[PDB]
Amino acid sequence: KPQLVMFTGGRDSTLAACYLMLQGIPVHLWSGNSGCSLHRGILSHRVEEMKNRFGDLVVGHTVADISGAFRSIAIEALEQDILKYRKNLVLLGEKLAIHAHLVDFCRRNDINTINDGITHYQMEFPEQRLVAKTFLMEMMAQYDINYQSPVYEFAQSADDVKYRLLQLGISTKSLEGISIFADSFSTPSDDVVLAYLREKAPLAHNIVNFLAGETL
Amino acid sequence: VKPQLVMFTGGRDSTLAACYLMLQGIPVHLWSGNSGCSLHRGILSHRVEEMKNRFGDLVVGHTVADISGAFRSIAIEALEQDILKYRKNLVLLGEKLAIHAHLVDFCRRNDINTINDGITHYQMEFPEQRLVAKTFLMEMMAQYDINYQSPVYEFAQSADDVKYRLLQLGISTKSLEGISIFADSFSTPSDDVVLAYLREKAPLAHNIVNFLAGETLNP
Amino acid sequence: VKPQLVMFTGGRDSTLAACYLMLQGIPVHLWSGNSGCSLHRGILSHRVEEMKNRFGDLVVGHTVADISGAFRSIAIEALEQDILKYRKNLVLLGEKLAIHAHLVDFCRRNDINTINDGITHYQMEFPEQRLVAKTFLMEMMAQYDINYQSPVYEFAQSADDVKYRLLQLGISTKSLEGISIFADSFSTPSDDVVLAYLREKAPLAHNIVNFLAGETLNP
Amino acid sequence: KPQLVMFTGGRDSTLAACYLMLQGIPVHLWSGNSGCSLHRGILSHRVEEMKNRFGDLVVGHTVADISGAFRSIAIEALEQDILKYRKNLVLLGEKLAIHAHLVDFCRRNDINTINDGITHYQMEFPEQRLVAKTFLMEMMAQYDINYQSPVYEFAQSADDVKYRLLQLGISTKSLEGISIFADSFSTPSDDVVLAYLREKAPLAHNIVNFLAGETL
Amino acid sequence: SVKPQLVMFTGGRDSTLAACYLMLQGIPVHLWSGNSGCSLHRGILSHRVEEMKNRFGDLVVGHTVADISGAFRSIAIEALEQDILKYRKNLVLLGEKLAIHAHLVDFCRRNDINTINDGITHYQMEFPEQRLVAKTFLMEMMAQYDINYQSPVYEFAQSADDVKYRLLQLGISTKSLEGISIFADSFSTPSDDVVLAYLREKAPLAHNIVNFLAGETLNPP
Amino acid sequence: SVKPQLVMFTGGRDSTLAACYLMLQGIPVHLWSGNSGCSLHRGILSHRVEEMKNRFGDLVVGHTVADISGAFRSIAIEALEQDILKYRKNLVLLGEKLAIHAHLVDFCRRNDINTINDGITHYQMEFPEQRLVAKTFLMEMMAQYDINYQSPVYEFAQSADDVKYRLLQLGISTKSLEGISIFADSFSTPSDDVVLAYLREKAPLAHNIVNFLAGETLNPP
Amino acid sequence: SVKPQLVMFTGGRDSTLAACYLMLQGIPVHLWSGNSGCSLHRGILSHRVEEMKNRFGDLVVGHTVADISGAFRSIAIEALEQDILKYRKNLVLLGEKLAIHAHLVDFCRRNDINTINDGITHYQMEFPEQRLVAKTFLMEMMAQYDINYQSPVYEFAQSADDVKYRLLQLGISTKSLEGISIFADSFSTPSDDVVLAYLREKAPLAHNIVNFLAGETLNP
């Protein structure tokens, strides 16, 4: 019954968690700390709001250190990555790293649905494009994991997410940390997003294998 | 005996409705909707204590529900348009619709199928207390198999009637409620206008019911 | 160095205004007006703690003032009439007038004669942030020998400008404020209409100043 | 500097206290318990509201047992009083009793101004009429005491008092006990109000003398 | 072990002796005290209650202090002008007894009690509440709800000294340790005819209150 | 008793020895640690600090841990795409040092300190931050604000073993007990010319931040 | 579930990763640390241990710190002048490993453990104890007592950066959080032949100590 939600504290992943819980689906909130987030403290205010409105349906909050996988995939070869694609795709790497950790986490805790707060209105960002959602859906499916985005189609604008949150008696603010990498990049082409993901998939599967104790 | 809900503000009329039900041995879940624009509501919980004191276990509980979101959606978000159109400030009618939306969800999630309020004959000047609105919101709740009753409507010919019955229960005669900032911010609308507004906003309210039940995200 | 007041919501613009003053060694009394219709304001005090952490004694204090009464008097009591007349929902302009009334009384009672806000060029779409209203309320406060300054008005060409300066102070970039339920409940009024409204309500506001000073009870 | 306010917790005496404190005049709040008030507990909520908004300007709250003077003046000879005036004027008696106690209290605590919340809009009630205010002003003046009603002229309706209270961030409700004698009477003529006061003045001056240790 | 009965208990010598005499017989008592809203200096009651738990233990099954100010006002105070102009007498303290009896009907029904006892005394028949015309009226009233209203010290107490010395033999104080009504000494002696006409004029309001307290109606008499 | 100086202190062996050598001379030190927002596993720092209070007592006058994430981002991260495309090298950790120096100008001015010291070492000149072209540039920068920037172990530390064994003679651990930048091992060796062009391109932004922190302007560079 | 194995654990990156990789496979580990009496600044070990209990839970079945100063002195120090004059090389740190292995035989027998693991790495070597000739000698020694001696990260560690970054992926610190020996950096590279003659000269002492620890003899 319980499913995982990739939960940052921001409005989009909050609404995704909340909508699932409204349906009677318990959620394990999963927060990945990639090592470069500033002022993350406000997250726990958001978590309290949700335990207050949904009770037992919030089954868990995990904060996971994913700095090592993030660094391996996105930072270690930054000079090469940027010279090649002429774009700073660290935050796309970060999502790959998340997904790698979630494979291990799901296997080790008997979870086979994962959910995030990707939104149609934020397609400007690499990690939130159909080409990357499709790539990662396929990736997770290879390990029998269902990857859903329960607010993707509904969220045509930020105002859409804001007002439903408000109807749940939850705050409209994004109560998350910010990446230091925020606003450190221009928009990449779809083709480049997908070539990057495919360039880093080997590293990511490798890390999955490592975390499972299978290899290297 | 199966608990019923009382829409409870702390004022004398909803207090007496709760109390009369409990005198009959019917347990009550007191339900208070906070629409986000109430001033000085602290005194509510004094009233609740008086009632646990007088009736014990028959007060199964008190829920204070944040309905600011639905209230804003229905009554405030389009306030300019709403007022320019109907030439009357119907926010407090909207707020009742918002309450009703939340009560559908609340009743379904806590297995409650009778709701009661403190509507009174002596206060029919206000839209939420007029037959046309009461009948509308009564049909609305019937559509979800919820019975909406007004146990002190007929009896309360004046405020003094409610006051002195409360006094016979050893409870205070004062209205111990917060006040809407929107109180007395409006002139009297026609019945026809009350009903056109309710009908204009019903879609939004049913939609919110569906959202709260987790059946949709869309409008 | 003589303390000044900052009209402080918790949002990035008023935060940066406070912070810039304190960087200069000017102590600030943070002043927050609660008009009674704000949702989810708890996060304000997180922002205040960040600021005491970063600047210490230069934060002489934080006042959270209930201005629901003046707000209702000026903006809500006659909402039907106000909207039908000007064909625009100017409650949030009223709320600023209410703030200004209270600040006159507060400044006089705490020996403060400079007030500062976080008005920003990038947000002039909203009435309270337009030259015509700022100039009006600036004259208003001058009539009581109070200097009303906007220390980040010129600098803030975009939100990103304010965000990154805050970040350089080790403070969060988020707007950690409650939201008015009246936010985004209105279309854009003409300057002429903004000014006619302010002028229509000035009597009420000066009257309230006089009441708060204990000089009259009458209107 | 400090003056006394006859304070019940209701809107009228609250506003009177508050208006005086806005002027920088400290107030000693004085509450007379005449022995027949129901559900008086809510008074202390009102007192807290005022200490919160005005601080040191609230110099005192005295709750005084005036049941004995009340009984002596208003109740002891109720059968005669009612047969004579064909009106139940207990609550007028009660005010006389208050004033008697206040003479003693003022003398013993160096206070020479007293204030109440009498209002123009409530002239239907005996104790709140010019004929009784004038009678009691004269009575208090005989002991060098100034009796003022700072909200009398301003309060043309209840809405007038309500909205100024609200501008002070105080509640609009009357947070007082009710006399059991509430609504137990019809309206008396001015002539009857004044004849009653004059019939009971001897008893009241006598009680003043008793409280001062001068007599009987 | 016998079925508990209720005693209308003020703390005074008369209701104290009535309670005590019942407990001497092995009848447990639920002490019931009506606060009608106008009582001064009632704190001394609990000293008397302690004396009684000390002397009789578990036979004292309960002390209930009931706020009956609302029914009192309704019956006795609300229409005081009219009541006094009509009967030329101040019968509030008679009203107060009617109010008590109304509450006792509800209380008895809700706590499975069918005998009530008071400390009415022959020597105090000058007071309206303790006259046979009133006692008889209230016995009838309570009987209509299958309640037995007894006055176990009425016949015995020819003078105050009679009650005092029996109390003293139980190691209990002879004093009346009760609050005083503010209405004490506020009334002259009424005729029997007037006592009964008043009770009859107020019976509708009393039955009505009984019905309200039982949750049977909200409409007024 | 001598005027306290500041040491840029990470917990590693080099900045530890620089602090220690100053304190051996009777110079008190204010340890200053910049948290640039991207450091992993920094908890072990405070073990090193305790070793140093243990060994030198009151000469350790302070430890300040400063959040410099904002200036770091502004200088090094905000324009990372452009920066890397231009210099064909990842110079974030050089930016980070500029950011530190900007904050130290403000900190020195606000705490009456006019000597700053670091643990730059000859053996680590492969890193941009520890090259003479950068050291010289920053000495000039700090001198413009009457601040003396010294590197008291630069000349001595020909190898890591040199620093290790001196530490050991003070009864202090030889290990680097610092957090690691996530940017560790994320960069190849840049030319001196490129190091200096970067510092010169970012100097405007650094002086601008100094001015902001001093409360002199809010306008951007 | 799976049968616990022992890891020779110093707190350094290589033995930490060896422990961790075993636990990733679901194999519980008993961490075993030998204190030979001449280690400086070893306090930081217990920080590393806490990181691992945090990351793997019950899979960390114990940490044993054994005082092996007695056996160390017996084998490596007592006859230091003779040993050095003879082999013209300071092989104390080789002796130290022999002493470790002696204690591990006794420990394994007394706690029902039959696999021991270390953090030897292909990239490092250079050091006598990590040389094939000594590794093979000690594998033979422990085989004589039915003990399996494995090196689970020998191949898999490609460089030091490779061990660092795997540790980082587990949310563990990259640092070597171990003490240093005072005998560090105090030796001239010895020949293979000399390493093996020393081991063979000291094996009698080591087997003797095993027997003593088992309570089988007092004599030499």
Ligand SMILES: Nc1ncnc2c1ncn2[C@@H]1O[C@H](COP(=O)(O)OP(=O)(O)OP(=O)(O)O)[C@@H](O)[C@H]1O
């Ligand atoms: N650090 C993280 N840990 C867990 N899940 C994350 C993390 N970062 C992003 N996600 C998931 O991926 C989605 C992509 O969000 P992104 O980082 O683009 O910011 P966003 O769209 O503003 O999301 P949100 O409002 O939920 O923070 C999030 O909605 C969340 O479900």
Ligand SMILES: Nc1ncnc2c1ncn2[C@@H]1O[C@H](COP(=O)(O)OP(=O)(O)OP(=O)(O)O)[C@@H](O)[C@H]1O
């Ligand atoms: N915010 C609310 N929460 C819960 N119930 C409410 C609320 N507002 C109104 N109601 C219900 O609707 C009834 C009618 O309310 P209305 O404001 O029209 O009259 P009222 O005299 O103020 O009621 P009351 O005496 O109960 O305060 C109330 O008695 C109550 O049962």
Ligand SMILES: Nc1ncnc2c1ncn2[C@@H]1O[C@H](COP(=O)(O)OP(=O)(O)OP(=O)(O)O)[C@@H](O)[C@H]1O
């Ligand atoms: N309720 C209030 N209390 C105190 N000051 C206020 C309040 N509302 C507005 N102000 C002042 O007026 C300024 C302009 O407010 P406005 O709502 O127009 O913009 P804003 O972007 O929301 O401001 P902020 O970023 O400070 O929240 C604020 O920055 C603040 O200085």
Ligand SMILES: Nc1ncnc2c1ncn2[C@@H]1O[C@H](COP(=O)(O)OP(=O)(O)OP(=O)(O)O)[C@@H](O)[C@H]1O
């Ligand atoms: N028990 C009392 N103790 C002290 N002052 C009293 C008392 N009762 C009345 N007063 C004073 O006399 C005035 C007459 O008030 P009254 O009893 O007629 O009720 P009211 O007009 O509703 O007043 P309020 O709202 O202040 O209770 C009060 O405003 C107060 O100043």
Ligand SMILES: Nc1ncnc2c1ncn2[C@@H]1O[C@H](COP(=O)(O)OP(=O)(O)OP(=O)(O)O)[C@@H](O)[C@H]1O
């Ligand atoms: N408030 C009350 N609560 C309970 N019982 C009461 C109350 N008032 C009167 N009674 C009962 O009715 C009787 C009436 O007594 P009454 O008031 O005439 O004075 P009393 O005879 O002096 O009282 P007491 O019994 O205390 O000596 C009491 O003896 C008691 O049994």
Ligand SMILES: Nc1ncnc2c1ncn2[C@@H]1O[C@H](COP(=O)(O)OP(=O)(O)OP(=O)(O)O)[C@@H](O)[C@H]1O
């Ligand atoms: N975050 C920081 N806070 C304070 N000082 C710092 C910081 N980063 C570097 N420094 C200073 O600048 C020098 C640069 O050192 P670098 O980053 O090249 O690594 P390192 O030489 O291994 O560091 P360490 O001195 O810790 O051994 C440090 O020795 C220290 O004096």
Ligand SMILES: Nc1ncnc2c1ncn2[C@@H]1O[C@H](COP(=O)(O)OP(=O)(O)OP(=O)(O)O)[C@@H](O)[C@H]1O
């Ligand atoms: N005293 C000891 N106690 C326990 N195990 C030890 C001890 N000395 C060595 N080992 C084990 O045998 C290996 C021998 O390698 P050595 O300690 O000489 O260098 P290293 O590989 O750098 O050490 P580390 O694994 O601690 O980083 C260690 O890695 C560890 O697995």
